[PDB]
DNA sequence: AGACACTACGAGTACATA
DNA sequence: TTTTTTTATGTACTCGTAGTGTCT
């Protein structure tokens, strides 16, 4: 269990084996895990768009901010990572992403609300927005203004002047 | 907490065959008296309404008033995999989440654990049907399926009049035009074949033939359809279930 | 607010051909032909907002009087048009068997005939070739190279004009005595020149500022409609200083909330249809405004490269 | 509770009343609305205007609170096509009211990135049922639109909010929070939104967070700068005067040391020097051509990526060979 | 009641239309060919269409006419077969004809005579052909298209019938009229002479009470580009209100009555190279937005065709100091940046509103740089051809690096470019010196990287300049390649 | 004004499905002796001819010949609503743009009219006088039904042979049945009849003939007359008047 | 009870695009 | 005077195995 992931983590490379699991771990990029911190302890968390050179450390953050957000229980049920990897149309944004994003938050365990804040939204990240067509962008304009209740999204981005 | 088995599995499938491609997302309120659930077409035409009690129930138990969202899509399919000689049970937690659909078999060891993740709907329960009608009539529902469509061929509205002691469903469209006129009386060897009509003032009003094919598809439920009607009120199409009763308000077209 | 009133587009809509002041031409023809009968195949083409639809509907209304309801078949492009329907329905229709008065014929009116497909457009040919004895087709569309040469060589071509400033005065100084509203002469100057020939949109910015402010003066309707969004780009474009351009583009188009996309779009159109300048100078400034408008496209699109394009277009005109 | 939502959201205007900047447009719409005459709207702005805000307070000033089942509210993320138009939008429009009387209102949502087929099957849809339903298009762009389209509704252009209505925004959210502002600071935020409510309230909620206190102290022009990473004017202006007058290395050595101490993007300086010289009285317009070309140039390909040094060294040596020939 | 018809009741299109093939206006040739034709159409058949006589009909069972639309080819048809004695079996778009439509209905009928033959006349034999079916199928070109549909159908019903078989069609040079190359008489309805459209006008003017002199049928003709229908369409609809048009309203006539018809890919390739229209005075009379409509009339032949033969032209435009070189460098500078523009255009996130951008820079601005006189012809785009053959070669050049990969461990263009100069003399070369002893070698080495016959037979085909073996392979003596491809088929090889 | 009353809708229902599929557009015209209906196929190959007399109708009032020109693909449409039960009555008035076709329930108190548009249809009514066929035969018309199913599945001609009083059913792998005349008393509904002048060669095609047999439900014997240079007549009787097939042969 | 007309949801094929 | 071209969502048409209510 925890030991295996132990090893694992110690077999292999150093640029996965030092990711920052913490809000802490990030060294410079001050400015913004600050405000992370800062919302943790209330439930105000907007709608983010990190956008910077490559390898500051923006996937890092928000997966060290969701992981400190829902603990490692509540990390697999109320998150929605969708990479580049994935195909991102006009077809998907519409069906799943909104799915998603009109679905109630999870019911948190008991050991879950004692040691994590637990806030009562989840977290739709799309990690590489660059390579999302204005269409499928635009279409998540009002399914991101309405469901903001239950949902809050985060993208990531290199060029911030590729999305709308 | 909430824990509702049914006696049978088939009465929760019609249930949702009722209106299964009729309206997308539901919003059940599970309560001391029983289930309902009120749901808005894509269109904004018509509204369902479904009210089953505590009578329906093998067992019921429900402590607070609790709401459960979902889409008809995934409820059919969640539905579909189940046997229609299991048991089914209705489970929710303290608060509202993923409902615990239970398959139980009455011979062998079969538990078919289903949990189906909740949607979060805009909770807008209004009060409707609290308003008098002009015009009240209850027919067979074989004849009105009949009815319904055999005039769905000849045009795509269907214009219904009441007038004193008559009835009559008109429909006037490109390759011909259809009416029939049906009559109120009262048989006594056959009391369901009956078709009763209080009228107290004239009405004349059209409806859609696409929204009139999926209201008929109701009947399976019950065998005698009671359609109020009323100058600028919603159409009630009600069949009476065995416990509760399942309505289904319509829109009249504008002339 | 319990009920809407009809706007003045829909309630003063004509319903006779007296009442059209389009081109006079085409109306007194129309108004002949529905007078003698005998009424052709035609397509009607031109703008958005000179009276089309209207013009159709009063010749198909005053030509079949009370027979309307059952000789007139209506299809819009909200309906379906496709090849089945032209098989089925409209076959059906011309098919159909109607006693009419000895100078009238059953009318198919097709608006938006500009968005049927082609399957459909050419299974008309012989439904309207084999019953044209007993049916008529009326076509309205705003562009007659959309509909296929077979389907215009057996009709009659009416070619819709813009509306010269007489006849929209005229129009809207019966509206006003109709709906005794105070205005004034530079407030209906300013509706014409805001209208740029759209009696529909002339009527809708007119009862915008009568029920938005009730006087319908010149400073009320540029209050309540900005100035037209090509001009604006033409006036930018033939400026002859770099700064006047810059200072154009600055107040009038940026500081009032225009998008890049649209300015450079406008940009673009107003350079194609320029006549001012030689042909050259005009395919110069389009290849300006395409390379400027690859980037407005990709997201890079800010004031620095409309100014950018302000300079490489003064650079160009510098001879 | 709505103390979950964000700040863009918490706030969102509920009536007319809150729906600052808009004067023109929100009196003439009363006044629709009251005399009962409301034609088709056709609300074109940019992003943050108040467009949405705008119809959803006017649909629930018409209907109540019933606002949610008594209008037909389409957008982008919602699949809008022609058959799409052809059943929803026709039999909305052709029937009645479920739960009054009274007209019905659609509200189409960003429908600039409907497709032609659809505006062309809509088109005939507003003229034909116009006594029973209204239509109210929102848009960005209104070259997205078909001309037919287009002039079937009144256009109100949403121009962008102007200083006192973001100050009188401002004002309000600090009585509604627990928070002070300097004056200085609140300028410096007017100047950095061009008009948007949204980035206005993100911020603002991003520097309450900076505080990093009970909120006993004020908000200074150095913890937005700090929050936002835009560059001070002073930064601005000495990196200008370093590259206008000191020589090629030491104008270098200065544009390094500002970028790096702060943390500086070289977007922003490029959109601030802009700025700057906008202002700036110079002779024959040859070396403004060559200033807005260059750098114009440099953003665009900044905007792909790149060596940012390398860019930064363009970016002087294109201010001083254009400022070479103003001599 | 219903019989009765009224002649303010017909149009003038249908009230004065051909009642006999003397009235018909023009083509007299095509006309004349098709009653040949079909006269001389049993006569064929009893001798299954193997003798031909001086007209060349006869061997042909079928005939397809066209030709622009409104010129009297349904007209012509249908009279020639009323003329003839048959009996008229029409169909046409209109109707639903797919695959399936008409095997079950026409099939039918390619050897069935017709029923009503028999009422109409029996008791008097005026022709053996009265009980004979004639298929005129109208708008052929109209079909769905495609593998599946009609078209193929009835191409193939063109060569098995005991019927004549008429096909009617406005535009013959089609990608679905391609089955109908070789298996039907092609006659081609073209434009109309002035004489006797001009004596019709003057009859059904007289007839109608309307005043029209001989001096304007020429312009209305040229304006209305060689449509009989819609010259009398436009006379039925202006007579009603202006009983006279000689020489003073015509000029609003013509301007009001013009035919928008989009050009052919080739004539688009003529107006745009064209040097009057980009000079000062044909610039304000064919606008820029004319221009630019003109690549829109066919925006995926236009930037090729321009490509093309942008080069192939004397310039007339050239300005002070420029020669023709200047000028086609400019053009195909031109070119590369409309190239560019079409590749955003047609890639992700669709950027179409671009195409405005791709007309001037892929075709007006080249055409503008080099227009002038046609020197020569104007060439088809030849960029398609020579795609399809470097997509082929592409393709057999991947196979054969799949089956070397095993050996080679170098990419495709790294084996075209390197593997090949040097498997050409491994392969062919021991051929040319040393006779048919250095099979075995050959087969080894071929065998050593898993190369077949037909791959052997791929690579040759590679080598471009002073290695060509397309004489090579047939210097070797017949031989020698009998032997190496009989000791193919005989040695097993390991895949 | 005519009015026409049948006793049940089922013998219309039967009577229009037996033809319903050669034809889509049929002239029904309207004397004082009956219903005349001649329809010829879209392909021209078939006509089919019915007339039905006063006997059939229960009440029947027809002051002037009238012309009917009605489809029946929405006259099928309108006629599957009708119940069997039910008393079908044609109703037209002056100039008759649309019919009226009524059902009315003797024992409930349900009336239920369907007013069809009809058509504009080019009448070129053709004179059937009669024409003396080489061959006149008469069979039932279940086993025409089967025998016709049975060629139909090995190709599409069908060569019917009359020669020798012997009648011959051929298709070309290659199928024949052959039929001897023979009278039964004890049965006569089998009786086979032939009346043959000359040896009749006809050869007809796969789906007329396959249409034709359908209306094999109103009948149980059918007649069949052949010529060599005449179309082939199928009769089939009705309780007052006949529906006749007029089918083409194909060419030798 | 079963056969087969009626039918409506689904895979495949193209066709544009200012 | 003539042939072809990668891909991306919306639109329209077609055959078509399939699921279920109905009649010999
Ligand atoms: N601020 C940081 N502090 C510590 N380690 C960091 C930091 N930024 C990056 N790293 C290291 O770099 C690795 C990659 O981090 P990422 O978050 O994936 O970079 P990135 O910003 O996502 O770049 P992309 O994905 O190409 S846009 C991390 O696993 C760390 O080992
Ligand atoms: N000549 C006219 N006289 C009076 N009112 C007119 C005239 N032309 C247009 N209108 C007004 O404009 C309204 C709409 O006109 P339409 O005929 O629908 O426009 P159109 O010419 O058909 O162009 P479309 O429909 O956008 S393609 C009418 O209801 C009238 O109120
Ligand atoms: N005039 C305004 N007064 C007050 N708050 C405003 C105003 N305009 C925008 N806001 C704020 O900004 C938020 C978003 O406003 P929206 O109306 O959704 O923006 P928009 O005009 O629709 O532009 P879009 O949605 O990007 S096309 C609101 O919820 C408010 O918090
Ligand atoms: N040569 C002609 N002489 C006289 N009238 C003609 C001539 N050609 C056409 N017409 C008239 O045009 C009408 C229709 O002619 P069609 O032959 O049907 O046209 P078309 O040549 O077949 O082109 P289509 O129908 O678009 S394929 C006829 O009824 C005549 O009134
Ligand atoms: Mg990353
Ligand atoms: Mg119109
Ligand atoms: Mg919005
Ligand atoms: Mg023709």
Same mark, same amino acid.
């Given at each position: 269990?925890?030991?295996?992931?132990?090893?694992?983590?110690?077999?292999?490379?150093?640029?996965?084996?030092?990711?920052?699991?913490?809000?802490?771990?990030?060294?410079?990029?001050?400015?913004?895990?600050?405000?992370?911190?800062?919302?943790?302890?209330?439930?105000?968390?907007?709608?983010?768009?990190?956008?910077?050179?490559?390898?500051?450390?923006?996937?890092?953050?928000?997966?060290?901010?969701?992981?400190?957000?829902?603990?490692?229980?509540?990390?697999?049920?109320?998150?929605?990572?969708?990479?580049?990897?994935?195909?991102?149309?006009?077809?998907?944004?519409?069906?799943?992403?909104?799915?998603?994003? $009109?679905?109630?938050?999870?019911?948190?365990?008991?050991?879950?609300?004692?040691?994590?804040?637990?806030?009562?939204?989840?977290?739709?990240?799309?990690?590489?927005?660059?390579?999302?067509?204005?269409?499928?962008?635009?279409?998540?304009? $009002?399914?991101?203004?309405?469901?903001?209740?239950?949902?809050?999204?985060?993208?990531?981005?290199?060029?911030?002047?590729?999305?709308? | 907490?909430?824990?509702?088995?049914?006696?049978?599995?088939?009465?929760?499938?019609?249930?949702?065959?009722?209106?299964?491609?009729?309206?997308?997302?539901?919003?059940?309120?599970?309560?001391?008296?029983?289930?309902?659930?009120?749901?808005?077409?894509?269109?904004?035409?018509?509204?369902?309404?479904?009210?089953?009690?505590?009578?329906?129930? @093998?067992?019921?138990?429900?402590?607070?008033?609790?709401?459960?969202?979902?889409?008809?899509?995934?409820?059919?399919?969640?539905?579909?995999?189940?046997?229609? #000689?299991?048991?089914? #049970?209705?489970?929710?937690?303290?608060?509202?989440?993923?409902?615990?659909?239970?398959?139980?078999?009455?011979?062998?060891?079969?538990?078919?654990?289903?949990?189906?993740?909740?949607?979060?709907?805009?909770?807008?329960?209004?009060?409707?049907?609290?308003? @008098?009608?002009?015009?009240?009539?209850?027919?067979?529902?074989?004849?009105?399926?009949?009815?319904?469509?055999?005039?769905?061929?000849?045009?795509?509205?269907?214009?219904?009049?009441? #007038?004193?002691?008559?009835?009559?469903?008109?429909?006037?469209?490109?390759?011909?035009?259809?009416?029939?006129?049906?009559?109120?009386?009262?048989?006594?060897?056959?009391?369901?074949?009956?078709?009763?009509?209080?009228?107290?003032?004239?009405?004349?009003?059209?409806?859609?033939?696409?929204?009139?094919?999926?209201?008929?598809?109701?009947?399976?439920?019950?065998?005698?359809?009671?359609?109020?009607?009323?100058?600028?009120?919603?159409?009630?199409?009600?069949?009476?279930?065995?416990?509760?009763?399942?309505?289904?308000?319509?829109?009249?077209?504008?002339? | 607010?319990?009920?809407?009133?009809?706007?003045?587009?829909?309630?003063?809509?004509?319903?006779?051909?007296?009442?059209?002041?389009?081109?006079?031409?085409?109306?007194?023809?129309?108004?002949?032909?529905?007078?003698?009968?005998?009424?052709?195949?035609?397509?009607?083409?031109?703008?958005?907002?000179?009276?089309?639809?209207?013009?159709?509907?009063? *010749?198909?209304?005053?030509?079949?009087?009370?027979?309307?309801?059952?000789?007139? *078949?209506?299809?819009?492009?909200?309906?379906?048009?496709?090849?089945?329907?032209?098989?089925?329905?409209?076959?059906? /229709?011309?098919?159909?068997?109607?006693?009419?008065?000895?100078?009238?014929?059953?009318?198919?009116?097709?608006?938006?005939?500009?968005?049927?497909?082609?399957?459909?457009?050419?299974?008309?040919?012989?439904?309207?070739?084999?019953?044209?004895?007993?049916?008529? /087709?009326?076509?309205?569309?705003?562009?007659?190279?959309?509909?296929?040469?077979?389907?215009?060589?057996?009709?009659?071509?009416?070619?819709?004009?813009?509306?010269?400033?007489?006849?929209?005065?005229?129009?809207?100084?019966?509206?006003?005595?109709?709906?005794?509203?105070?205005?004034?002469?530079?407030?209906?100057?300013?509706?014409?020149?805001?209208?740029?020939?759209?009696?529909?949109?002339?009527?809708?910015?007119?009862?915008?500022?009568?029920?938005?402010?009730?006087?319908?003066?010149?400073?009320?309707? /540029?209050?309540?409609?900005?100035?037209?969004?090509?001009?604006?780009?033409?006036?930018?474009?033939?400026?002859?200083?770099?700064?006047?351009?810059?200072?154009?583009?600055?107040?009038?188009?940026?500081?009032?909330?225009?998008?890049?996309?649209?300015?450079?779009?406008?940009?673009?159109?107003?350079?194609?249809? *320029?006549?001012?300048?030689?042909?050259?100078?005009?395919?110069?400034?389009?290849?300006?405004?395409?390379?400027?408008?690859?980037?407005?496209?990709?997201?890079?699109?800010?004031?620095?490269?409309?100014?950018?394009?302000?300079?490489?277009?003064?650079?160009?005109?510098?001879? | 509770?709505?103390?979950?939502?964000?700040?863009?959201?918490?706030?969102?205007?509920?009536?007319?009343?809150?729906?600052?900047?808009?004067?023109?447009?929100?009196?003439?719409?009363?006044?629709?609305?009251?005399?009962?005459?409301?034609?088709?709207?056709?609300?074109?702005?940019?992003?943050?205007?108040?467009?949405?805000?705008?119809?959803?307070?006017?649909?629930?000033?018409?209907?109540?609170?019933?606002?949610?089942?008594?209008?037909?509210?389409?957008?982008?993320?919602?699949?809008?096509?022609?058959?799409?138009?052809?059943?929803?939008?026709?039999?909305?429009?052709?029937?009645?009211?479920?739960?009054?009387?009274?007209?019905?209102?659609?509200?189409?949502?960003?429908?600039?990135?409907?497709?032609?087929?659809?505006?062309?099957?809509?088109?005939?849809?507003?003229?034909?049922?116009?006594?029973?339903?209204?239509?109210?298009?929102?848009?960005?762009?209104?070259?997205?639109?078909?001309?037919?389209?287009?002039?079937?509704?009144?256009?109100?252009?949403?121009?962008?909010?102007?200083?006192?209505?973001?100050?009188?925004?401002?004002?309000?959210?600090?009585?509604?929070?627990?928070?002070?502002?300097?004056?200085?600071?609140?300028?410096?935020?007017?100047?950095?939104?061009?008009?948007?409510?949204?980035?206005?309230?993100?911020?603002?909620?991003?520097?309450?967070?900076?505080?990093?206190?009970?909120?006993?102290?004020?908000?200074?022009?150095?913890?937005?700068?700090?929050?936002?990473?835009?560059?001070?004017?002073?930064?601005?202006?000495?990196?200008?005067?370093?590259?206008?007058?000191?020589?090629?290395?030491?104008?270098?050595?200065?544009?390094?040391?500002?970028?790096?101490?702060?943390?500086?993007?070289?977007?922003?300086?490029?959109?601030?020097?802009?700025?700057?010289?906008?202002?700036?009285?110079?002779?024959?317009?040859?070396?403004?051509?060559?200033?807005?070309?260059?750098?114009?140039?440099?953003?665009?390909?900044?905007?792909?990526?790149?060596?940012?040094?390398?860019?930064?060294?363009?970016?002087?040596?294109?201010?001083?060979?254009?400022?070479?020939?103003?001599? | 009641?219903?019989?009765?018809?009224?002649?303010?009741?017909?149009?003038?299109?249908?009230?004065?239309?051909?009642?006999?093939?003397?009235?018909?206006?023009?083509?007299?040739?095509?006309?004349?060919?098709?009653?040949?034709?079909?006269?001389?159409?049993?006569?064929?058949?009893?001798?299954?269409?193997?003798?031909?006589?001086?007209?060349?009909?006869?061997?042909?069972?079928?005939?397809? +006419?066209?030709?622009?639309? &409104?010129?009297?080819?349904?007209?012509?048809?249908?009279?020639?077969?009323?003329?003839?004695?048959?009996?008229?079996?029409?169909?046409?778009?209109?109707?639903?004809?797919?695959?399936?439509?008409?095997?079950?209905?026409?099939?039918?009928?390619?050897?069935?005579?017709?029923?009503?033959?028999?009422?109409?006349?029996?008791?008097?034999?005026?022709?053996?052909?009265?009980?004979?079916?004639?298929?005129?199928?109208?708008?052929?070109?109209?079909?769905?298209?495609?593998?599946?549909?009609?078209?193929?159908?009835?191409?193939?019903?063109?060569?098995?019938?005991?019927?004549?078989?008429?096909?009617?069609?406005?535009?013959?040079?089609?990608?679905?009229?391609?089955?109908?190359?070789?298996?039907?008489?092609?006659?081609?309805?073209?434009?109309?002479?002035?004489?006797?459209?001009?004596?019709?006008?003057?009859?059904?003017?007289?007839?109608?009470?309307?005043?029209?002199?001989?001096?304007?049928?020429?312009?209305?003709?040229?304006?209305?580009?060689?449509?009989?229908?819609?010259?009398?369409?436009?006379?039925?609809?202006?007579?009603?209100?202006?009983?006279?048009?000689?020489?003073?309203?015509?000029?609003?006539?013509?301007?009001?009555?013009?035919?928008?018809?989009?050009?052919?890919?080739?004539?688009?390739?003529?107006?745009?190279?064209?040097?009057?229209?980009?000079?000062?005075? &044909?610039?304000?009379?064919?606008?820029?937005?004319?221009?630019?409509?003109?690549?829109?009339?066919?925006?995926?032949?236009?930037?090729?065709?321009?490509?093309?033969?942008?080069?192939?032209?004397?310039?007339?435009?050239?300005?002070?100091?420029?020669?023709?070189?200047?000028?086609?460098?400019?053009?195909?500078?031109?070119?590369? +940046?409309?190239?560019?523009?079409?590749?955003?255009?047609?890639?992700?996130?669709?950027?179409?509103?671009?195409?405005?951008?791709?007309?001037?820079?892929?075709?007006?601005?080249?055409?503008?740089?080099?227009?002038?006189?046609?020197? &020569?012809?104007?060439?088809?785009?030849?960029?398609?051809?020579?795609?399809?053959?470097?997509?082929?070669?592409?393709?057999?050049?991947?196979?054969?690096?799949?089956?070397?990969? +095993?050996?080679?461990?170098?990419?495709?263009?790294?084996?075209?470019?390197?593997?090949?100069?040097?498997?050409?003399?491994?392969?062919?070369?021991?051929?040319?010196?040393? &006779?048919?002893?250095?099979?075995?070698?050959?087969?080894?080495?071929?065998?050593?990287?898993?190369?077949?016959?037909?791959?052997?037979?791929?690579?040759?085909?590679?080598?471009?300049?002073?290695?060509?073996?397309?004489?090579?392979?047939?210097?070797?003596?017949?031989?020698?390649?009998?032997?190496?491809?009989?000791?193919?088929?005989?040695?097993?090889?390991?895949?």
């Amino acid at each position: 269990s925890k030991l295996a992931a132990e090893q694992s983590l110690a077999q292999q490379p150093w640029v996965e084996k030092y990711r920052p699991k913490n809000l802490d771990e990030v060294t410079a990029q001050d400015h913004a895990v600050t405000v992370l911190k800062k919302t943790l302890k209330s439930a105000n968390l907007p709608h983010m768009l990190f956008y910077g050179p490559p390898g500051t450390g923006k996937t890092s953050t928000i997966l060290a901010l969701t992981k400190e957000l829902y603990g490692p229980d509540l990390m697999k049920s109320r998150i929605l990572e969708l990479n580049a990897s994935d195909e991102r149309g006009i077809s998907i944004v519409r069906e799943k992403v909104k799915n998603f994003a $009109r679905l109630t938050v999870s019911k948190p365990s008991k050991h879950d609300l004692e040691n994590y804040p637990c806030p009562p939204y989840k977290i739709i990240i799309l990690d590489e927005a660059d390579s999302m067509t204005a269409d499928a962008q635009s279409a998540l304009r $009002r399914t991101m203004e309405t469901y903001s209740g239950v949902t809050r999204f985060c993208l990531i981005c290199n060029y911030v002047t590729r999305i709308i | 907490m909430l824990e509702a088995k049914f006696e049978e599995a088939s009465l929760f499938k019609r249930i949702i065959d009722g209106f299964k491609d009729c309206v997308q997302l539901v919003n059940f309120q599970c309560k001391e008296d029983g289930i309902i659930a009120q749901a808005v077409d894509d269109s904004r035409v018509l509204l369902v309404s479904l009210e089953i009690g505590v009578e329906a129930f @093998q067992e019921y138990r429900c402590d607070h008033p609790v709401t459960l969202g979902m889409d008809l899509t995934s409820l059919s399919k969640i539905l579909r995999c189940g046997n229609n #000689t299991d048991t089914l #049970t209705l489970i929710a937690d303290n608060t509202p989440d993923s409902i615990i659909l239970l398959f139980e078999d009455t011979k062998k060891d079969r538990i078919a654990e289903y949990s189906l993740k909740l949607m979060d709907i805009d909770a807008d329960f209004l009060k409707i049907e609290e308003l @008098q009608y002009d015009s009240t009539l209850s027919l067979p529902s074989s004849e009105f399926s009949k009815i319904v469509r055999d005039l769905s061929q000849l045009s795509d509205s269907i214009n219904i009049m009441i #007038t004193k002691e008559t009835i009559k469903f008109v429909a006037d469209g490109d390759i011909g035009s259809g009416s029939v006129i049906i009559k109120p009386f009262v048989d006594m060897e056959h009391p369901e074949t009956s078709i009763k009509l209080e009228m107290d003032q004239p009405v004349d009003l059209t409806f859609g033939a696409k929204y009139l094919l999926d209201i008929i598809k109701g009947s399976s439920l019950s065998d005698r359809v009671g359609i109020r009607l009323s100058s600028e009120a919603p159409a009630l199409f009600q069949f009476d279930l065995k416990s509760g009763f399942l309505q289904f308000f319509l829109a009249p077209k504008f002339n | 607010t319990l009920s809407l009133q009809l706007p003045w587009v829909e309630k003063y809509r004509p319903q006779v051909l007296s009442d059209i002041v389009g081109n006079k031409e085409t109306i007194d023809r129309l108004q002949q032909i529905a007078k003698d009968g005998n009424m052709p195949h035609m397509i009607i083409s031109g703008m958005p907002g000179i009276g089309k639809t209207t013009s159709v509907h009063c *010749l198909a209304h005053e030509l079949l009087g009370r027979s309307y309801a059952d000789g007139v *078949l209506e299809l819009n492009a909200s309906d379906d048009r496709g090849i089945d329907v032209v098989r089925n329905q409209i076959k059906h /229709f011309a098919q159909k068997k109607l006693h009419l008065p000895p100078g009238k014929h059953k009318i198919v009116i097709l608006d938006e005939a500009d968005s049927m497909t082609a399957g459909a457009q050419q299974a008309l040919r012989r439904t309207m070739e084999l019953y044209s004895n007993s049916t008529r /087709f009326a076509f309205a569309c705003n562009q007659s190279n959309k509909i296929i040469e077979p389907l215009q060589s057996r009709c009659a071509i009416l070619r819709y004009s813009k509306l010269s400033d007489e006849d929209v005065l005229k129009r809207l100084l019966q509206i006003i005595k109709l709906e005794d509203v105070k205005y004034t002469n530079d407030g209906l100057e300013a509706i014409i020149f805001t209208a740029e020939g759209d009696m529909r949109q002339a009527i809708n910015n007119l009862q915008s500022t009568v029920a938005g402010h009730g006087l319908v003066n010149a400073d009320n309707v /540029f209050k309540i409609v900005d100035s037209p969004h090509p001009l604006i780009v033409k006036k930018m474009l033939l400026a002859s200083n770099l700064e006047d351009s810059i200072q154009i583009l600055r107040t009038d188009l940026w500081k009032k909330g225009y998008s890049s996309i649209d300015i450079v779009t406008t940009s673009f159109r107003v350079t194609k249809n *320029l006549a001012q300048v030689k042909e050259s100078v005009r395919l110069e400034m389009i290849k300006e405004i395409g390379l400027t408008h690859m980037r407005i496209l990709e997201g890079v699109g800010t004031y620095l490269q409309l100014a950018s394009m302000l300079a490489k277009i003064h650079k160009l005109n510098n001879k | 509770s709505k103390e979950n939502l964000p700040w863009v959201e918490k706030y969102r205007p509920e009536t007319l009343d809150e729906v600052y900047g808009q004067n023109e447009v929100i009196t003439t719409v009363r006044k629709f609305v009251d005399e009962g005459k409301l034609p088709h709207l056709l609300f074109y702005g940019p992003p943050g205007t108040g467009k949405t805000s705008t119809i959803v307070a006017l649909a629930r000033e018409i209907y109540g609170k019933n606002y949610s089942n008594m209008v037909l509210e389409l957008n982008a993320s919602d699949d809008r096509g022609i058959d799409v138009v052809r059943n929803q939008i026709k039999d909305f429009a052709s029937t009645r009211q479920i739960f009054s009387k009274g007209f019905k209102l659609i509200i189409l949502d960003e429908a600039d990135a409907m497709t032609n087929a659809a505006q062309n099957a809509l088109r005939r849809v507003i003229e034909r049922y116009t006594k029973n339903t209204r239509f109210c298009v929102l848009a960005n762009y209104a070259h997205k639109l078909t001309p037919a389209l287009l002039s079937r509704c009144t256009r109100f252009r949403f121009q962008p909010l102007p200083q006192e209505a973001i100050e009188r925004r401002i004002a309000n959210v600090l009585v509604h929070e627990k928070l002070k502002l300097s004056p200085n600071a609140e300028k410096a935020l007017i100047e950095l939104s061009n008009g948007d409510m949204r980035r206005v309230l993100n911020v603002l909620q991003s520097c309450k967070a900076t505080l990093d206190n009970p909120d006993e102290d004020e908000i200074s022009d150095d913890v937005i700068y700090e929050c936002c990473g835009a560059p001070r004017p002073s930064d601005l202006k000495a990196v200008l005067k370093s590259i206008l007058e000191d020589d090629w290395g030491t104008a270098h050595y200065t544009l390094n040391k500002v970028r790096s101490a702060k943390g500086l993007a070289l977007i922003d300086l490029i959109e601030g020097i802009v700025k700057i010289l906008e202002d700036y009285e110079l002779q024959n317009e040859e070396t403004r051509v060559h200033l807005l070309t260059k750098l114009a140039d440099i953003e665009y390909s900044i905007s792909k990526g790149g060596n940012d040094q390398i860019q930064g060294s363009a970016v002087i040596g294109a201010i001083k060979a254009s400022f070479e020939n103003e001599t | 009641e219903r019989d009765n018809v009224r002649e303010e009741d017909k149009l003038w299109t249908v009230k004065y239309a051909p009642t006999n093939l003397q009235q018909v206006c023009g083509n007299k040739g095509s006309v004349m060919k098709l009653k040949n034709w079909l006269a001389n159409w049993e006569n064929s058949k009893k001798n299954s269409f193997k003798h031909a006589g001086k007209d060349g009909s006869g061997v042909f069972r079928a005939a397809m +006419l066209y030709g622009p639309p &409104g010129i009297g080819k349904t007209t012509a048809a249908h009279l020639v077969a009323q003329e003839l004695g048959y009996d008229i079996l029409e169909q046409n778009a209109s109707d639903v004809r797919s695959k399936t439509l008409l095997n079950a209905g026409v099939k039918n009928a390619l050897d069935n005579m017709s029923v009503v033959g028999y009422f109409k006349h029996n008791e008097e034999a005026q022709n053996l052909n009265g009980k004979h079916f004639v298929i005129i199928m109208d708008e052929v070109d109209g079909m769905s298209g495609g593998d599946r549909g009609g078209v193929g159908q009835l191409a193939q019903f063109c060569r098995k019938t005991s019927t004549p078989l008429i096909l009617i069609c406005n535009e013959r040079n089609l990608p679905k009229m391609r089955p109908f190359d070789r298996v039907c008489l092609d006659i081609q309805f073209r434009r109309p002479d002035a004489n006797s459209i001009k004596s019709r006008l003057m009859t059904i003017a007289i007839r109608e009470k309307f005043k029209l002199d001989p001096n304007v049928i020429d312009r209305l003709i040229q304006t209305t580009r060689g449509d009989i229908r819609q010259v009398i369409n436009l006379l039925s609809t202006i007579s009603t209100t202006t009983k006279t048009i000689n020489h003073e309203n015509i000029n609003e006539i013509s301007k009001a009555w013009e035919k928008n018809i989009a050009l052919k890919p080739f004539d688009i390739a003529h107006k745009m190279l064209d040097g009057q229209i980009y000079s000062d005075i &044909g610039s304000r009379n064919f606008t820029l937005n004319d221009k630019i409509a003109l690549y829109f009339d066919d925006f995926d032949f236009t930037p090729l065709m321009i490509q093309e033969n942008y080069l192939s032209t004397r310039p007339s435009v050239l300005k002070p100091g420029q020669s023709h070189l200047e000028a086609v460098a400019e053009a195909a500078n031109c070119i590369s +940046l409309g190239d560019i523009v079409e590749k955003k255009i047609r890639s992700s996130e669709q950027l179409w509103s671009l195409l405005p951008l791709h007309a001037v820079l892929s075709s007006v601005y080249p055409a503008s740089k080099v227009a002038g006189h046609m020197a &020569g012809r104007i060439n088809f785009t030849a960029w398609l051809g020579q795609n399809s053959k470097s997509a082929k070669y592409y393709r057999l050049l991947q196979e054969i690096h799949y089956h070397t990969r +095993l050996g080679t461990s170098t990419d495709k263009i790294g084996l075209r470019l390197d593997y090949l100069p040097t498997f050409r003399k491994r392969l062919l070369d021991p051929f040319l010196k040393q &006779g048919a002893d250095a099979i075995s070698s050959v087969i080894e080495v071929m065998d050593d990287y898993y190369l077949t016959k037909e791959d052997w037979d791929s690579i040759m085909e590679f080598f471009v300049g002073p290695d060509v073996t397309t004489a090579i392979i047939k210097k070797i003596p017949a031989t020698v390649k009998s032997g190496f491809t009989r000791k193919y088929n005989s040695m097993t090889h390991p895949v």
